[model samples]
Target: RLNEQNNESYRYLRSVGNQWQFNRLYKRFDTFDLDSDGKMEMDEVLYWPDRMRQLVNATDEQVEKMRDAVRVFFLHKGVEPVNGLLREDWVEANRVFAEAERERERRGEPSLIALLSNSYYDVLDDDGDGTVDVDELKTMMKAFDPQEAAYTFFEKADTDKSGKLERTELVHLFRKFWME
Candidate 1:
């Protein structure tokens, strides 16, 4: 029901401005809320990378971008509720982020999938290589769905006999699950 409410509000945002793309920004914001406080604090957004770094090697640049993204959401997008964001504020923030994504796509730049895949691949590539090992795939896969055997998915995703999955392979695997 809550998600339904969010969806309705999000749809209205798009109706008001057709420039917004559905880039999953709202879902990402909800994930980062952490406490379900009906608001998200800047400090919490700033600290999210540290929490996420426990699972993956999050870089300083990545953390800084996240921090700046929140700042842009609040300040530039008019979503700030005295330095944080409430649900209504977050809805507008998603609209702004989605609008930016649409502009990026229009300019022949990468879309949200590419951006998310790049960052996700960077994090999942544990050894700093350009590939993900079966173990890493299994770890991440199981996190998303404990019932699915990671080894099976890894075998299916690794088309070549390279014994590892590259960025494209990982992205395809993610799309398979997410699109389902």
Candidate 2:
């Protein structure tokens, strides 16, 4: 069960950690390369919709939204591969993000995780209401401990106790969600 945050008992993809975590990300990339074609086509990107099945309700619209979300996620990474996402392209970007995240962290600035997370956050907002409620977040963590996700959001991310997430709060949580 290569489910979200389930089967990955000890793997890490958030940091370089001497490049071990980078290799972990490579393994994840290979998993995304569903056809063994060594590239991530939209067909492969839709694998996310498959695993995140609980959110789509078998409804085409929900699935498509998640599709857009995935595209947004990678697009924020500056990788719009016309030939589909190549492994080399992914690794190169991941390496850059990992190193740059460290550099920015030391300088007390936002890192690539925040940049990428903001894009993911943009897609999750669903209604452009400028805040993310529980349901919208469910769209991302459905396959995993969705309840835990909600808990995390309310307990840690919703800093204003407003029952919603804005960019600043979410950027911090999203950093933890990605790298940490």
Top-scoring candidate (lDDT): 2
Model 1 lDDT, residue 100, Cα:
51
- Highest TM-score scorer: 1
Model 2 per-residue lDDT tens digits across residues 1-180: 111131111122223242323348788677667788876766556566566554433445545555566664554342443545577667555554555556557768655556555655655675767777778777767643254467666568887889888888888886775556
TM-score of candidate 2 to 2 decimals = 0.50
Candidate 1 C-alpha lDDT tens digits along 1-180: 112133332343455455344346567557667687767766665454344456665577754554454344334333343546675566555555455545555667554545455565666675777788887765565433242577888888899869998878876775454324
Per-model TM-score on C-alpha atoms: 0.50, 0.50
Error of 2 at 43 (Å): 6.8
Report, for every candidate in turn, its global Cα lDDT versus the true structure. 0.56, 0.58
Which regions of candidate 1 fall more than 4 Å away from where they truly are? 1-30, 56-82, 110-113, 137-165, 169-180
